[PDB]
Amino acid sequence: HPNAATSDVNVTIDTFVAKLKRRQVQGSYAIALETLQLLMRFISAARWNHVNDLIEQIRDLGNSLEKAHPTAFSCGNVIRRILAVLRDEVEEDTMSTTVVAEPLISSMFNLLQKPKTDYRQVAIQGIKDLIDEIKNIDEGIQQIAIDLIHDHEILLTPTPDSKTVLKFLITARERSNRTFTVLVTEGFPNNTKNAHEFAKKLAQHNIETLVVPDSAVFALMSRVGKVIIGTKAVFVNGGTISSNSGVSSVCECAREFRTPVFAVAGLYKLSPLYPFDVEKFVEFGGSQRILPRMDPRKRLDTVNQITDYVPPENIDIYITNVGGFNPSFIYRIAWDNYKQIDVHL
Amino acid sequence: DSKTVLKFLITARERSNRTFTVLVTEGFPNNTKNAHEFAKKLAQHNIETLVVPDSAVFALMSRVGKVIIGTKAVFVNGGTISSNSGVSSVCECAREFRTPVFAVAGLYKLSPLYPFDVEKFVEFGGSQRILPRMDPRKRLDTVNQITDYVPPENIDIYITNVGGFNPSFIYRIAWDNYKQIDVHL
Amino acid sequence: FNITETYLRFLEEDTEMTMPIAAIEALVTLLRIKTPETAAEMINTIKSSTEELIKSIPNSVSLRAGCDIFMRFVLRNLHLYGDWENCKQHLIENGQLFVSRAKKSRNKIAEIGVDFIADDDIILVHGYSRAVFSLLNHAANKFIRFRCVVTESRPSKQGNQLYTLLEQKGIPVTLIVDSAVGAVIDKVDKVFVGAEGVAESGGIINLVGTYSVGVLAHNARKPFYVVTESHKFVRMFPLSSDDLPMAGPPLDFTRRTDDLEDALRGPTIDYTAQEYITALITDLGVLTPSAVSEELIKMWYD
Amino acid sequence: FNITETYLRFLEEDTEMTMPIAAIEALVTLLRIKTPETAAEMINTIKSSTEELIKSIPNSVSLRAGCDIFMRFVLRNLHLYGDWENCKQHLIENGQLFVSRAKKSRNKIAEIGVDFIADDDIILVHGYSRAVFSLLNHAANKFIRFRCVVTESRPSKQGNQLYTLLEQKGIPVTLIVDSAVGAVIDKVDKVFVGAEGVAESGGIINLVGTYSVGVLAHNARKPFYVVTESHKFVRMFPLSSDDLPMAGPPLDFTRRTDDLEDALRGPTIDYTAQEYITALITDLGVLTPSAVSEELIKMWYD
Amino acid sequence: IENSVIGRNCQIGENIRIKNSFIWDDCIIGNNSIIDHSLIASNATLGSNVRLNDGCIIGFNVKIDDNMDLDRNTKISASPQDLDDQTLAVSIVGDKGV
Amino acid sequence: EDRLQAVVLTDSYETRFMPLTAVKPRCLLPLANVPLIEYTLEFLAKAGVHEVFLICSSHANQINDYIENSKWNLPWSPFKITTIMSPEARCTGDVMRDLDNRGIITGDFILVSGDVLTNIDFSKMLEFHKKMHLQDKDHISTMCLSKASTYPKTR
């Protein structure tokens, strides 16, 4: 399913594709915003009449988007949420049209046993809700953040690439009476400059900064107290896609040492589809960025990867804008945002 | 308690520029008085002392860097029987949280006899200083041991008059002063 | 109205229709005699039937679980509180409907669970479950990239049978013994285990060893799996390292002998914990972490 | 004259003989025929014979070790710088004497070094070794209260044999499945071993499934032990978790060829790491921590 | 196989050695064949027992059929003339063409 | 900065491919398992196109068919493909002459000879060009050159 039905209704699909491919769009937030705008455009223009057909169309669109790009997840998630929002309203409408509804609580056996129209405004409202959810993650976690780390204790911090993580760290640092030391690992071929920037910021912020070469983690692990993953995407079985490079090894080390591993992200980054593999999801960077030369470099096939995956084992807790969820619990949260038929397109 | 360990501590304290923090577990039965004496002695020179309850180790072990023991009996596979009161659980905790262990020892205090069973070598102790009067002792069953054995899975260094040795290696050291013949007679 | 006969009829059949399914069908048929409306006559009779089944059972809980599920379904049924005949009719219908559902479930599995196969990954299927085998077959049909491996299982020669079945396909086959599984740490890529019951959260009943396998996987940090269709949801939790209803005695130090009498005794049944398993495989969308427990909560409200 | 013939000679009896002791004796016998005064016509020939023996091996490991030990002994022998006759005579003598010493060592093991099973500590043993059984029998003799636990051996049905050998004493025993090894760690105390050879690295050269067992022991922190007549240090280094000089293929990947055939080739030899020996029962006094390595160093003067 | 590329709708029988290659649209890699630093173009197909070497350039409809041995840097004509080896059955080792 | 037309020299380097290029046009041949033209088009788009023009020659019917097939053909694209059809066989001077005769020539027009596909972001380059133009009236055309592995060998 490519572009064929779209005429003088929606054109921006191509622009979106372009943004995805050559990277003029940067940061997950921006992508989410773009997606929201696209959805708005869809809503204000497309022809409705029937409801099931509209739903089908939406599904098709989603499928097309998926086909176009995999590494973007926030975009997908937002769409899914909107679909879910639509679904409840649709159900309500159906219930009115038909006219027992609820026994005590939400119950199973629904998959075995047999279970003019307005919705545009509701769809619009859903988009607004999504926007609100997106607005600020840090303004919703920093109250459950200056609660874990304390005096004379030592942090270990990989991935300063996620914008949330840095902010969280800054919030933690704010206090005048409290004092703590921060270790920051690099992650060379994809995250060095960012790491340097983070270090500089820390220095500026009147805190005891420590520069770490990626090798020297082991000779300081005796003093290590906490581990924070700078993730960008979240999944079904609790797992997370990181904001690129140099996390996995550190996580493994922490696990070996049995040293606390916390996860900071957000529930807009939460996806309703399982990471069936890592190969289809995680992409590789540029082999040219490690070593120069070209003509004798046909022999020198060099390997470098951007994104990182962490198993549903090394992760422990996920404090969100709502609160502290867990790896063996996030499924329900996902369901609460994205509904049954909406997952499979 | 011993004058060796005390002397070592004094020597350590003499170079007071080194930042060392003293956490002393009381040791439920007999060790308490000895601990107090040690504390007093420390105070005599001016050394900071912090008193630790025996129940609370799990809430402290994640913070503690290095552990020093002044043991009496040293053994074959790397284990020790120390001068009484709660060591085993502490060691287990250390193993769980990964903590380095030092020991002030002597090769003359080291034994070439191997401890093979927990059922024999662990010495049970008196219930004289636990509960006053003996009428509740009819139905209840008080289980208590004074001196305890340590498994070699935990300690890693034995600082002696010669030097620091590996636990899974101390047998060689022992044999560099003792024999295989003088064991079973 | 007779269940022992039904039990006798089904033991090594399976293949076409799942063992539990047949039992469920039988239960439905039994229900559709004494009327589901008259709850005084019906529920007691159902209980009696369950008791009979238990009596006839040696080393299983799956059938019991199925009947409990059926009971739950029945309970759910009457929540329309209007016309009493339609509900009854629906109840009558849901028996062969359950059987039909199985096909659909299989189809679903053949679409969702076929995404897992990657470049050069060796697959080892544990125990006996039809669904897992079907999945494997569907993977073979897709021709991703794999290797189908069998075991030396010991109930009434199951592993051998499985191996023979695999041979039919043609895919090259090598075997793993119950003891010689220890060498497998990274070479066989992913550890798959078939299920004969799924409990609260991570609790799964199979055959003569799963817990050890799970432990091994944990040690190796290997991906561990539970693979099934849809008919096994139980409200159960054990206390010790292992606790189950048993016909074969645990640690039976056999009496003094010289000419052989009875010896083949030990832990015939095996359970698995929550921590060991990374992925749960069911047709019910894509659920993994602790969805079954939630489902149970939704159902029972007890 | 042949060492092979000598080896063939002993089959049904043995149980009393100890690996290299018989082999060593055979070697000695071979030596004391073709003039043991000279060194050019002798040592080289002995080496050649050993090589031939190695070539001829169906499935036996410790022979090489025995030969090496013999060589070492020979080397030790000629350092007195007196006369060729006396030393030669001594060499000739030292074979029967060595054999005799083995029995003494066994006796020592059975009377002094048997204080590991005394307080009804249930023993987890797999792999048929003679020393183990001697220890068992002499424990029974001393009346030193005990219970036995053995995992079922089914590559060639040695389990039955083991059971029979346990009926002679007259003490209740139980069957254990090697997949349900994770199921039972509850009442059984520690894991003890009867094996084939002692490694240069520290671990143990053993039969069908051992690594898993080791892992389980580690998980349970119930210490792992080895019971052997202590002169089976084979000149072999297991550098990895799955690489060794082996009698057969390492996890033989078989093709789908015929009907129910290429699967019974079970990996009947496996290994576990060096960080497992809490104690090893040796006849030179109870010495373990890094003892084998020390011995090796002493032998190769490095 | 070492560092070689296979194109669209190209069929492989059994037992083939390949080293450092690129292959275009619809080119059958025949039973027992070696492709080294050499290209095979659209509709041109390799049959049984062909031993190619470094830099063998192939054009349109070169039907490489049965038993051939081509040396290094050999160029083969394309369009359905100026260079040796032609479009018809078997490339030149024993003279065939018009 | 904005409104820039694309002119690409196609059907020119035939027979330079020593055996190939006679029946179907030079560019139509499948490159990396899929047609070469597409990559070039993508590159052009990235750079900044407002209308697509190619100077096709060798058997025009096939080119037309390709155009019909293509994605830039129907309304949705910001730029359409309408290839310049001229008399057979001519050099780059002659091609230029033909173009001039045809008429559609702009200020800052883009001319790429043959087919190219690379990574470097073109906006910056364009900006630099503009800056250079703003300096003096006498500024002409832009060259693209990149560094290699120290010594030359396969050149």
Numbering used by the authors:
A (entry chain C): 10 to 108, 113 to 128, 147 to 376
B (entry chain D): 192 to 376
C (entry chain B), D (entry chain A): 4 to 305
E (entry chain I): 357 to 436, 455 to 472
F (entry chain I): 24 to 178
Quote the authors verbatim:
The map obtained using a linear mode dataset only did not yield a high overall resolution (5.7 Å). To further account for the different conformations of eIF2 in the complex, we also carried out focused EM data classifications using combined dataset without applying any internal symmetry and we obtained another four density maps (maps A to D in Supplementary Fig. 1), however, at lower overall resolution. To separate the different conformations adopted by eIF2 γ and β, we have applied two masked classifications. After the first masked classification, we obtained three maps A-C with conformations of eIF2γ tilted towards the PLD domains of eIF2Bγ subunit and distinct extended conformations of eIF2β. The tilted conformation of eIF2γ is stabilised by the contacts of eIF2β with the PLD domains of eIF2B γ and ε subunits and the contact of eIF2γ domain III (eIF2γ-D3) with the eIF2Bγ PLD domain (corresponding to residues 97–101 and 136–139 in eIF2Bγ PLD). This conformation results in a slight rearrangement of the three domains in eIF2γ, compared to the TC structure. Also, the eIF2γ G-domain in this conformation is more disordered than in the TC, possibly reflecting a higher mobility of this domain in this particular conformation. In all three maps, the density for eIF2β allowed modelling of the zinc-binding and central domains in the conformation similar to the one in the TC, but with the zinc-binding domain only partially covering the nucleotide-binding pocket and extended central domain approaching the binding interface between the eIF2B γ and ε PLD domains. In this position, the ε-cat domain would not have access to the nucleotide-binding pocket on the eIF2γ-G-domain.
